[PDB]
Design a protein around this ligand. Structure first.
Ligand SMILES: Cc1cc2nc3c(=O)[nH]c(=O)nc-3n(C[C@H](O)[C@H](O)[C@H](O)COP(=O)(O)OP(=O)(O)OC[C@H]3O[C@@H](n4cnc5c(N)ncnc54)[C@H](O)[C@@H]3O)c2cc1C
Ligand SMILES: Cc1cc2nc3c(=O)[nH]c(=O)nc-3n(C[C@H](O)[C@H](O)[C@H](O)COP(=O)(O)OP(=O)(O)OC[C@H]3O[C@@H](n4cnc5c(N)ncnc54)[C@H](O)[C@@H]3O)c2cc1C
Lengths: 448, 449
C-alpha cells in the first residue's frame, strides 16, 4: 500500500509526529510491534509515577503520620490490588490513544517493520511504501556482561514483578536507578543502591547529588559507592549474591540492572536503506532530525538525544510542521530542557549546573543564590527532610541560566520557572513577583 | 521619652518585614506587639492552617486513597493533642527565629498595646515613645454576625484553640478561609457542613473554579448548603447547637465556626489624636506609597483594605523601608497580578483576570480562553477520581496571557513560576515553546490546544 508518512514505532515520538502530520491532510500509517504508547506508557513514566505515589502513601502512613497524631496499623499491603489498579489505568490510556489515531484517520499496523529499501517496508508479509518514513524505535535496557547477569531483572522486569521482594539491590547511578531504589525503599523492602563512583547523579548540580546522599543515609536506600559488579551467584536457597570487584558482596532476593539503555536500531535492516548509525548504534540525525537518506528521519531515544518523552514529542511535532506545513526551519532547540526526577525527595533542574556556568562564563561572572530549609510537611516530625534550591545567575544583570532544587514540591514547581528561564528571566524578574505563602516555590522569588 | 527613627505598631507580617529592612540601613527602631510575634499568619493563620491541611492529606491518604493502592490500614487512634503539640512547638521555633533576627538588627521589641497620644507620640504601658516615622500595621480580626446565639459560635482563632475535633461541624462563610477550614475538617473525619449565602463559595474566583469546587464537595464532602442566611443559633439541652436559617432550614452540630469576614483592628488606638483618616469600613486610607494623610505616619497590610495576604504585607512593608531609608523615592508595591493559592480540597491557584473580568475589560472579540480538564493522576487509579481543571485567559492577536487559573492536585506548588512568567508579559507562544515535564499536572499549561 502507499502512504505519505509512515512512523515506525508507536511510542512518544511516533504518535506525536504522525498525529500532527495527519492534521495537515497527510495519509499516515503507524507501525507498532507491541503496545501503543511505547516505553513511557507501558514500562516507563506512567507506571513509575503510580508506584511513586504508592511509596508516598506508605511513607505518609508509616513515617510521617505518627507525629501528626495518627497511630496506624498496615494490616496488609495487597500488591495485586495495586498492579490491577495500575494496569486498568494504562488500559484506559491505550483506548484513548487508539481513539485519537482513529479520529485522525491514521492506519495503525500491529507488527514488526523492517526496511526492504529506502522507501519500502515489510510488515507481517505485506510490503508498504511511503515518501517519508520516521524511525522512532526507542531503546531498551542494557545488561552487563558478567557471570550470572541473567539472574538479575531490568526495569521492564520490575514492572512485571509478582510480589515486592524482601531485599532488593538496584545497580546503576542515573535517574532510573535512583527512582526505582527510592520507590522500592519507600514501599518497605530492604533496598541497596550500588553506584560505580562516589554519588548517584554525578552530572547533576553538586548540591543535588550531595543532598540526595544525605537523605539516603538518613532514610534509605542503603547506598554503596565504588561498587563495580563482578558476578552474581544464585544460592541454593534461591537468593542471589552480588559480588563486587573489591570483595564486597550482598545477598538479596532480587537484583535490578539499571545501568543504561541502548538504541533499538538493530534488527530492522537499516543497511538496505543505507541509514548510518554511529559507534554506539544511534541513528545520526542533523538539527532537523534528517538521517543521511533523503526522506528518512529519526526522533527520540534511538537518536541518542536526551531520553525524555517531551523531547521525543516536541521533536516529532516540529518535524511534521517542517515537512507538511511548510515551516522549513522548524526544529527543537535541545537546550534548557527541564528535567524532574521522582526521587525521594524529587529533583527539578533546568539550565546549567554551577560548575558548567563557571566553566562557560568564568567565576567572575557567576553569582549563585542558595536556600536550604526543612520541608514544612516534615518540620513537625522526627523525620525532617532538607529542601535545597539554587539559582545560577551570570553578569551584572544576573541573567538566570540554571535553576536547581531538591525537596518536596520540586516536581510541580519547575514548569513555570522553565517558561521564565526560556523567556530570559533575570533575578530582578523573580524578585519582582509576589510570593505565594506558604509554599516551597516562593523560596525562588525571595532569595537574597 | 525615648526617641526612635522608626516605630511599627504591630509585630505581624508587615510590621516585622518593614522594621527589619529599616533596621538594615541603620535606623534605630522599635516594634510594639501586644500578643505574639508573627501576627495572624504565624499564630492563627498561614502556618497552623497549612500544618492542619497536611494532617487532612495524611488522613485522606490512609483512609480514602490508600485502600485502592493496596494498603489495608486501621487508624488505631488519632491523637489530636499530639498534632496540636507538634504544631505549637513549630510555631514557638518560628517565634525564636524572629526574635533572633530582630535582636541581631538591634530592634527594641516592646510587648504591650500602643495608642497614639499625638501625631508623633505613642504610649505603651504608661511609657511614652516618639519617632519621626510611625508605621501602623495592626491587621484585622474575625467578624461575627449580629444575630441571637452568635456567642455559641467560635471563629478561626477559636478553631486553632480547639481542644478536640468535634464530631459534627458547621462552617459559615463563602470565602477562602471558610473553604479551607471546611475542607480540612472534613478531611480529618468530622461530619462537616459549609453554609454559603448565595449559589456557590468563592463567587469572586473564575467560574470554572467555584464550579469544580461544588462538584468535588458534592462527591466527597463537606456538605454544601447554598442560599443560607443564619437567623439564630440555639444551644440545645444536650450541648449541641442548632443553626437556624432564615428560610427555615436548620442543622444541629457540635461546633459552629463563623468565617464570614474579617474587620480592621484600627479602632482602639486613638487615631483621632493623630489625625489619621479611615474610610467607611474602618480601614486606614493610604496612597500608592502607603502614606496616610499625616506626614510621617504610614500603614501596610490588612488594616488598609488591600488584599489580605502575608506576601503583600511583606512586600509593601520592605518597599516602604527602601523608599524611606534607602533613597528609592519611587519604590512601592504593584498590587496587580498578585498570585493566590487556596489550600482547599483540591488546591486552587489563580493569578490575573478571571474570564468574566477579561471579557468586560477587553470585549469578547479580543479574549481567547484555553481550558483543560483531566483526572489527577494520584486519584486516577482509585475509586475516588478527582478532576483537575485549568484555564489560560489570553487577549489580542498575540494572545497575551492575562489570567492563569487552576484547581487540582499540584496547583499549590506550580503557580509561582507561571506568575513570574505572567509578570514578564508571557504570550501563549512563550508557554508553547517551553518543553513539558512529564508526568506532571503543570505540563498541561504548556501543551494546551
Ligand atoms: C523506567 C523508565 C522511566 C521513565 N520515566 C520517564 C518520565 O517520568 N518522564 C520522561 O519524560 N521520560 C521518562 N522515561 C523516558 C521515556 O520513556 C522515553 O524517553 C520515551 O519513551 C522515548 O520515546 P520514543 O518515541 O523514542 O520511544 P519509545 O516510547 O520507547 O517507543 C518506540 C516504539 O517502537 C516500537 N518498535 C520498535 N521497533 C519496531 C519495529 N521495527 N517495528 C515496529 N514497532 C517497533 C516499540 O515497541 C515501541 O513501542 C522513562 C524511561 C524508563 C525506561
Ligand atoms: C485563618 C487564616 C489563614 C490565612 N492563610 C493565609 C495563607 O496561607 N497565606 C497568606 O498569604 N495569607 C494568609 N492569611 C492572611 C494573613 O494572615 C494576613 O494577610 C497577614 O497576617 C496580614 O499581616 P499584617 O501585618 O497586616 O497583620 P497581622 O499579621 O494580623 O499582624 C498585626 C499585629 O498587630 C498587633 N497589634 C494590633 N494592635 C496593636 C496595638 N495597638 N499595639 C500592639 N500590637 C498591636 C496584633 O496583635 C498582630 O500581631 C490568613 C489569615 C487567616 C485569618
Amino acid at each position: 500500500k502507499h502512504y505519505d508518512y509512515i512512523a515506525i514505532g508507536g511510542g512518544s515520538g511516533g504518535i506525536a509526529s504522525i498525529n500532527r502530520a495527519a492534521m495537515y491532510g497527510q495519509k499516515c500509517a503507524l507501525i507498532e510491534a507491541k503496545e501503543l504508547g511505547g516505553t513511557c506508557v507501558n514500562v516507563g513514566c506512567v507506571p513509575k509515577k503510580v508506584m511513586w505515589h504508592a511509596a508516598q502513601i506508605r511513607e505518609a502512613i508509616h513515617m510521617y503520620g505518627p507525629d501528626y497524631g495518627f497511630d496506624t496499623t498496615i494490616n496488609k499491603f495487597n500488591w495485586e490490588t495495586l498492579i490491577a489498579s495500575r494496569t486498568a489505568y494504562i488500559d484506559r490510556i491505550h483506548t484513548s490513544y487508539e481513539n485519537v489515531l482513529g479520529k485522525n484517520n491514521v492506519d495503525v499496523i500491529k507488527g514488526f517493520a523492517r526496511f526492504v529499501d529506502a522507501k519500502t517496508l515489510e510488515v507481517n508479509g505485506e510490503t508498504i511504501t511511503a515518501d517519508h518514513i520516521l524511525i522512532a524505535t526507542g531503546g531498551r535496557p542494557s545488561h552487563p556482561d558478567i557471570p550470572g547477569v541473567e539472574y538479575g531483572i531490568d526495569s521492564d522486569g520490575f514492572f512485571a514483578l509478582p510480589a515486592l521482594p524482601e531485599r532488593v539491590a538496584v545497580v546503576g547511578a542515573g535517574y532510573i536507578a535512583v527512582e526505582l531504589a527510592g520507590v522500592i525503599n519507600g514501599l518497605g523492602a530492604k533496598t541497596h543502591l550500588f553506584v560505580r563512583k562516589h554519588a548517584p547523579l554525578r552530572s547533576f548540580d553538586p548540591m543535588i547529588s550531595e543532598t540526595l546522599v544525605e537523605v539516603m543515609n538518613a532514610e534509605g536506600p542503603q547506598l554503596h559507592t565504588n561498587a563495580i559488579p563482578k558476578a552474581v551467584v544464585k544460592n541454593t536457597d534461591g537468593s542471589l549474591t552480588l559480588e563486587l570487584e573489591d570483595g564486597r558482596s550482598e545477598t538479596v532476593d532480587c537484583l535490578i540492572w539499571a545501568i543504561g539503555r541502548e538504541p533499538a536500531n538493530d534488527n530492522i535492516n537499516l543497511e538496505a536503506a543505507g541509514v548510518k548509525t554511529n559507534e554506539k548504534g544511534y541513528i545520526v540525525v542533523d538539527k532537523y532530525q534528517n538521517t543521511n537518506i533523503e526522506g528518512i528521519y529519526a526522533v527520540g531515544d534511538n537518536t541518542g538525544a536526551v531520553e525524555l518523552t517531551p523531547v521525543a514529542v516536541a521533536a516529532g511535532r516540529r518535524l511534521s510542521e517542517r515537512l507538511f506545513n511548510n515551516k522549513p526551519d522548524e526544529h527543537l532547540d535541545y537546550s534548557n530542557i527541564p528535567t524532574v526526577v521522582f526521587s525521594h525527595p524529587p529533583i527539578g533542574t533546568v539550565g546549567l549546573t554551577e560548575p558548567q556556568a563557571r566553566e562557560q562564563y568564568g567565576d567572575d561572572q557567576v553569582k549563585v543564590y542558595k536556600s536550604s530549609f526543612t520541608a514544612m510537611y516534615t518540620a513537625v516530625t522526627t523525620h525532617r527532610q532538607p529542601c535545597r534550591m539554587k539559582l545560577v545567575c551570570v553578569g551584572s544583570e544576573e541573567k538566570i541560566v540554571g535553576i536547581h532544587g531538591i525537596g518536596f514540591g520540586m516536581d510541580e514547581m519547575l514548569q513555570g520557572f522553565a517558561v521564565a528561564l526560556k523567556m530570559g528571566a533575570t533575578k530582578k524578574d523573580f524578585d519582582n513577583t509576589v510570593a505565594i505563602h506558604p509554599t516551597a516555590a516562593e523560596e525562588f522569588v525571595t532569595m537574597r
